[PDB]
């Protein structure tokens, strides 16, 4: 899982919306087609380390990146093993 990414998990997930849930509303008119200035562009990237397009949607309970799922919040082999332990409600093998 690259176990040191579980350090860098919260470091790249938490402050993304703890900085850009409200500060994006603070500049939501200017670069949009409503009028264009560089003070908002100076406001845009005077830091760098906040990014809401850095979250790769790592898996939940063991953290494997590839094979992640939208609805389940789990990845390739963990969707399987939770469905085999019955941890997921109402989920049989698909057949029709």
């Amino acid at each position: 899982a690259k176990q040191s990414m579980k350090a860098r998990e919260v470091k790249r997930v938490a402050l993304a919306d703890k900085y850009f849930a409200k500060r994006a509303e603070l500049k939501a008119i200017i670069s949009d087609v409503n009028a264009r200035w560089n003070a908002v562009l100076k406001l845009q990237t005077l830091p760098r380390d906040s990014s809401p397009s850095r979250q790769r949607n790592r898996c939940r309970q063991t953290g494997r990146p590839h094979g992640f799922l939208r609805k389940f919040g789990l990845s390739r082999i963990k969707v399987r093993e939770a469905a085999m332990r019955g941890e997921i409600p109402g989920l049989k093998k698909a057949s029709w």
């Binding site: 939940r60 309970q61 609805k71 389940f72 919040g73 789990l74 939770a82 469905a83 085999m84 332990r85 019955g86 941890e87 997921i88 409600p89 109402g90 989920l91 049989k92 093998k93």
Partner: protein, 206 residues
């Protein structure tokens, strides 16, 4: 090698869900999130307490933690040891202001984990498997349990490239779906080698 998990095919069949909550889209991943941190944690105290299953439903902002056991006299503690203490966990780290429901299923040498984890408890004791298997097969043959299938994984005795085991017995019709198999693998951490165990138990046709 070449199998399916005998629970995973049969949850859509008359074998019921051992956990069944319901929610909707956004919280659909955060609810079984909460259901995992209790299932990794109830093992950590109820290990010697003959743990069988953990059942969770969500009626209304609460979970009915329906613990199934077979040795409940050590589960309760000093008659109040594990009433609110094991509701203290679910309130924040699961986020669920819930209740607790402990309940015994009898026959403490017939459930899947129990037949599994006893042999581990006998291999953590490190008795001979050749004396352990041959009796612990027939504990199921004692109390009913119409069929058994127990494979002990390798690194057993003195070897580094080892073999598998069987004691097939009675009838284990797991390839036919209508056979409600109480299956649960366990793992025994003897020093050299991960000596695992696979236990198939057939509890009657339906």
């Amino acid at each position: 090698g070449q199998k399916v998990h005998p629970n995973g095919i049969r949850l859509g069949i008359v074998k019921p869900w051992n956990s069944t909550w319901f929610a909707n889209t956004k919280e659909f991943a955060d609810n079984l999130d909460s259901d995992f941190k209790v299932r990794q944690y109830l093992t950590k105290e109820l290990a010697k307490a003959s743990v069988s299953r953990i059942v969770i439903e969500r009626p209304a902002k609460s979970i009915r933690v329906t613990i199934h056991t077979a040795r409940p006299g050590i589960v309760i503690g000093k008659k109040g040891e594990d009433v609110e203490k094991l509701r203290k966990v679910v309130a924040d780290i699961a986020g669920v202001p819930a209740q607790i429901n402990i309940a015994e299923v009898r026959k403490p040498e017939l459930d899947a984990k129990l037949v599994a984890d006893s042999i581990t408890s006998q291999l953590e004791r490190r008795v001979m498997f050749r004396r352990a298997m041959k009796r612990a097969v027939q504990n199921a043959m004692r109390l009913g349990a119409k069929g058994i299938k127990v494979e002990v994984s390798g690194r057993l005795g003195g070897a580094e490239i080892a073999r598998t085991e069987w004691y097939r017995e009675g009838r284990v019709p797991l390839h036919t779906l209508r056979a409600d198999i109480d299956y649960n693998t366990s793992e025994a951490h003897t020093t050299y080698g991960v000596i695992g165990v696979k236990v198939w138990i057939f509890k009657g046709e339906i």
